[PDB]
Ligand binder design. Structure first.
Ligand SMILES: [Zn+2]
Ligand SMILES: [Zn+2]
Ligand SMILES: [Zn+2]
Lengths: 253, 165, 253, 165, 250
C-alpha cells in the first residue's frame, strides 16, 4: 500500500491546508460507479439492504441501487399509506371491499374447489396469517403488474405458505416495496425463484410472528357469505386453476 | 505529526449523524502505531448514513510513515452500529468479508465484519474502476434497523474533474 | 530478543547495587496501560476475575479494571457487601418487605396469569431455589437502575432459570456486584446476552447443584395471602407482561 | 556471578504475600542453565496480589549469559497458587495471554498455565506499548479463591520519569 | 558420540588397568541428583516404584525417592497381609483401634437410611478397605479419615481416604504395603473442595483369593450398639459425606 501513500501524499497534504475543499470533495463523491449487482436465483430478500430493488427478467437477475434504476425513480406517486396500522385497517375492512383484493379470494375459492375442502375453514386458516394479505396489499397496482397469489400447505410448522406469481417475463420489485415487505411481516421469509418460465416469490414462515398481540379479529363467515354472493370472473378462476396445476409440482425454496 | 489532528480530520470527513470520534487508542505517533481503534463512531436505530471508508483509511496510511494496513471494523452490537478504525489488522475478526459482487452484507446481533485497505485496493483493481486519485472512493451505506444492520459497500465517484497536474 | 534484554541487563546491573531504588521503581509500576478489554457476547461471568466490571452498551461490549473504571471509582456509594447470613435473612423476611421485593412477586403474578396457573405453588417452587432471590437482592439498585426479573422453565435441569432485564441502552455490572453474585450463588452460571436490543443476564443451574442444602424454609401460603391483599401497580404488571411476551421466544444460552 | 543473587533479587522484587522463594533452586551456573524452576512461590487462600512477571523474566535473562527464554508457570493446586520460574520451556502450555484478547484466565483444581518471555515481547509489540525500559511491564494479578484461582495479565506502566539519561 | 568416546577413553583405560578403583567409582555413584519428580492429579499409585513417596501439597505435587523424603527418614518406628488379616479377624475386640471405620459406617447408614447389618456385611465383604484403614493408621499418625461410597460398574463399595490438612505425605513403605496388600484394588490420588483424597476402587475383577477367615457381622453390630461413639466425629463424617456427595470418582 506504499504506492497509494506515494501518489496520494501530495493530494492529502494540499487538502489539509483547506478543510472546506476537503469536505466539499468528499461530499461530492456520491455517484455510484456500480449500479447493477449480479444476483443468482433462488434469492432470499433478507440479503437485500434498504435502497435496493430487484430486477428479475430475461436480461438477468440483478439488484439495483434504488436511486438510479429508472422505474424506481418513476414511482406510482405517493402511495405511502403502507403503515402496519393501515394494513391492519385493510385486513379488518376486507368484508366491505370484497371487489378489491379479488386475486386473494379467487385463489382461495380455486384452492377450496381443487382440494375438495370447506371454504369457511380455508378462509379461517388463511385469515389466521394476515401477513400474506399484507404482502398481497403492498403488491397491488390493481392490474398494473397485479401479482397473482397461490396458496399451498406449508411444511414444518404452518397452515398455508404463499406463492406470489409475477405475470410476464419480467419483475421489478421497488426498493421501498421490498423494505416494507420485510418490515411489515418480519417472521416470514421471502425467496425469489422461477418455475416453468414464470417468476415467483415464495413466502414461508420463519418464526412465530402472527402478531396475535395486535392481530384484529375479522369474521370469516361474513367474508364467506359475501364471496358466495358475488360472482367471480371466470378468467381469474381459470387462470388460478392453471397456475395451481403448473405449480403443484414445485419444490419450495 | 498530530495524532489528534488525524482524529479531528476524520470526524470532519465522516457525517455528523455518526455520533463518535473518541480516541480509545492512547498517545500514538506516526512512527508508533497502536493496536486499538484510532477512531470510534456509532449510530442509533434508523441511522441510514454513509461512511467514507476509503478516504479515512488512505488518510491513516498517509499520516503514518511506517508501512501498515489501515483497517475498519463494523459491529452490529446489540443496540447501535459501531465503526472502529485500527492502524493494523486485528486478530479474531473477519478480514475480507467484502467480496466483489457481494456489496450487500447483513449483521445480526453481536455480529462483526471488517475490511483492510489492501483488500479494498485489490477489490477496486479487480472491478477495473479508475485508479486515478479521487476517481473512485468506497462508501459504506449503513441502515440500522434493529435487530439487524444492513451495509452496502458501494464505490462512489466524483462529479467533476477538478485540478489534475 | 536477547540483546534488547541485554540493554535492560545493563540497567539491572546498575540498579542491583542500590536495591532501594529497585523496589521503588517496581512499586511505581502500578498504572494499567490497558484499561478496556474487548469482549464478545455471549459471555459467562465466571471468566470475570475480581476487580473487573462489564460494560455492555452501543459503544461496545467491554470489560474494565474495577479500580480504574470511572463509574466503578464512584462505586455507587459502595452499599457495603451483603453477607451470606444477611441474604438468608432477607430470603426469610421477604414476607414483611413486600415492597422491597415487589418486582420479583409481580413477575410471579404475571407468570401465574400468563400460564393460567395458581400463584401459590409457583411462588413455592420459585422460592425453593433462593439463589435467584439472592441475585435480585444483590443487583438491586436505588433509583431506576433497579433491575427487572423474569422467570422461565429450565431445560436440561430441574427447576427455573432467571433473566435479569436491565432497562435502557446501557448496562454496567460493578465488579463487587458480580463477584458477590458469583460467590453467593455457587451452583448457578451467569451469562450476559442481548435480545431485541435489550441487555439481559441469564442465570441458570450449573455444575450439578453445588449449593448448600440447609437453606431455611419459608411458608408460601402466608406470602400468597399477603400478595392477595396487596394490589400491585398496573404499570409494572403491564411491563412484565410485555417482557414475558418478548422473551417467550429466547434461545437460552 | 551469584548463583543465589538472582533468587535473592527476585525475592526482593516479588511482594511479601507470595510466600516462597529460596526453594527448588537446583545448582546452576550462569553458563549452564537448569530445567528446574529457579524460584517457587506460593500463596494461600484469599491472596489477591500482583506479580511482576516481565521484571522477573528480564532479570532471569540478565543473570544468564547464554541464549535462553525465561518462562513463568502458574498452577492452581486446589489449596494454594504456585508460581514457578524456569530458565527454559518446561514443555508446558505456551500461554493464555498469547491471545491479546484473552487477558483474563481462570484455573480450576490442578490446572496450569504459563508464559515465556518471547510471548511477552510478542504481546508487548502487538499492543504497541512503549518499548523503552520500564515503560510497560506485564503484571499477573492473582485472586485466590477456594475452588478456582483467577489471574489477569495486565500491562502496567510507570507513574513518573525514570530520571535516566 | 565421538566427543564422549574421546573424552572418556583415557579414564576408561586408566580404570581398565585398575579394576578395583573402577568398582569403587561405579559403586560411589549412589547420590541421586534428581530427588523430586513432578506428578499431576489424578495420579494412580501403580506408577509409584517401591522407593517413591508422594508429597501432595500446595508447594507442588511431587514424588520423592523413598531414601530422601525427610519425614520418611524419621519414619523409624512404623506389617504385610498377615497382620492385616489377623486384625480383620479380631476387629470384634478392637473397636477402639478402628473407631473411624465403624463410626463412618454408622454415619453412612444414617445418610442412606440403610440397615447397619447389611452395610456391615457388605463392608466386611471387602476386607481390602479394612487393610487400607489399618495401614494408614500408623503409630502416631493423624488418623486419616475414611468415607464409604457405593461402587459403580464393579459391584460393592469404594473407599475415600480423606487426608486432613493442606498437605499429604504418603510414605513409600505405606504405599508399597497398600499396593501389595490390595492387589485387586486401584488407588488414585486426587483433590476435591481443597481437600486431598485417595480413592480406592475395585480393579482387574477379583484377583484376590479368599484366604481371609470368616468374621461375624452380628457380633460386631451388637458390640457397636453397646459402644457409644464420641460426639463430633459423627458430625464430621456427615459433613464429609455432604461435601463429597457430588464427587466424580476418578
Ligand atoms: Zn428499481
Ligand atoms: Zn466499571
Ligand atoms: Zn516421603
Amino acid at each position: 500500500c506504499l504506492h497509494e501513500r506515494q501518489r496520494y501524499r501530495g493530494l492529502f497534504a494540499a487538502l489539509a491546508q483547506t478543510p472546506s475543499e476537503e469536505i466539499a470533495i468528499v461530499r461530492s463523491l456520491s455517484v455510484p460507479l456500480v449500479k447493477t449487482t449480479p444476483v443468482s436465483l433462488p434469492f432470499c430478500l433478507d440479503q437485500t439492504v434498504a435502497d435496493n430493488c430487484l430486477t428479475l427478467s430475461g436480461m438477468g437477475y440483478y439488484l439495483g441501487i434504488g436511486g438510479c434504476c429508472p422505474a424506481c425513480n418513476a414511482g406510482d406517486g405517493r402511495f405511502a399509506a403502507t403503515s402496519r396500522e393501515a394494513l391492519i385497517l385493510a385486513f379488518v375492512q376486507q368484508i366491505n371491499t370484497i371487489f378489491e383484493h379479488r386475486a386473494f379470494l379467487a385463489s382461495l375459492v380455486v384452492l377450496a374447489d381443487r382440494h375438495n375442502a370447506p371454504l369457511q375453514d380455508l378462509l379461517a386458516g388463511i385469515l389466521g396469517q394476515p401477513e400474506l394479505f399484507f404482502v398481497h396489499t403492498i403488491l397491488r397496482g390493481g392490474g398494473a403488474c397485479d401479482p397473482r397469489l397461490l396458496f399451498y400447505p406449508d411444511p414444518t410448522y404452518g397452515g398455508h405458505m404463499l406463492y406470489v406469481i409475477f405475470p410476464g417475463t419480467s419483475a421489478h420489485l421497488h426498493y421501498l416495496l421490498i423494505d416494507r415487505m420485510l418490515t411489515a411481516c418480519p417472521g416470514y421469509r421471502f425467496v425469489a425463484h422461477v418455475w416453468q418460465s414464470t417468476f415467483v416469490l415464495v413466502v414461508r414462515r420463519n418464526a412465530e410472528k402472527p402478531t396475535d398481540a395486535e392481530i384484529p379479529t375479522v369474521s370469516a363467515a361474513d367474508i364467506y357469505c359475501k364471496m358466495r354472493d358475488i360472482s367471480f370472473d371466470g378468467g381469474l378462476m381459470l387462470e388460478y386453476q392453471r397456475l395451481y396445476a403448473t405449480f403443484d409440482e414445485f419444490p419450495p425454496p | 505529526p498530530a495524532f489528534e489532528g488525524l482524529v479531528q480530520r476524520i470526524r470532519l470527513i465522516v457525517p455528523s449523524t455518526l455520533r463518535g470520534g473518541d480516541g480509545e487508542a492512547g498517545p500514538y505517533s506516526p512512527s508508533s502505531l497502536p493496536s486499538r481503534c484510532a477512531f470510534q463512531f456509532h449510530g442509533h436505530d434508523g441511522s441510514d448514513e454513509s461512511f467514507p471508508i476509503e478516504y479515512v483509511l488512505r488518510l491513516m496510511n498517509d499520516w503514518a510513515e511506517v508501512p501498515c494496513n489501515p483497517y475498519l471494523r463494523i459491529q452490529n452490537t446489540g443496540v447501535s452500529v459501531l465503526f472502529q478504525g485500527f492502524f493494523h489488522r486485528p486478530h479474531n475478526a473477519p478480514g475480507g468479508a467484502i467480496t466483489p459482487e457481494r456489496t450487500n452484507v447483513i449483521l445480526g446481533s453481536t455480529e462483526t465484519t471488517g475490511l483492510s485497505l489492501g483488500d479494498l485496493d485489490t477489490i477496486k483493481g479487480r472491478l477495473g474502476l479508475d485508479a486515478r486519485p479521487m476517481m473512485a472512493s468506497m462508501w459504506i451505506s449503513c441502515f440500522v434497523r434493529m435487530p439487524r444492520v444492513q451495509l452496502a459497500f458501494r464505490f462512489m465517484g466524483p462529479e467533476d474533474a477538478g485540478r489534475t497536474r
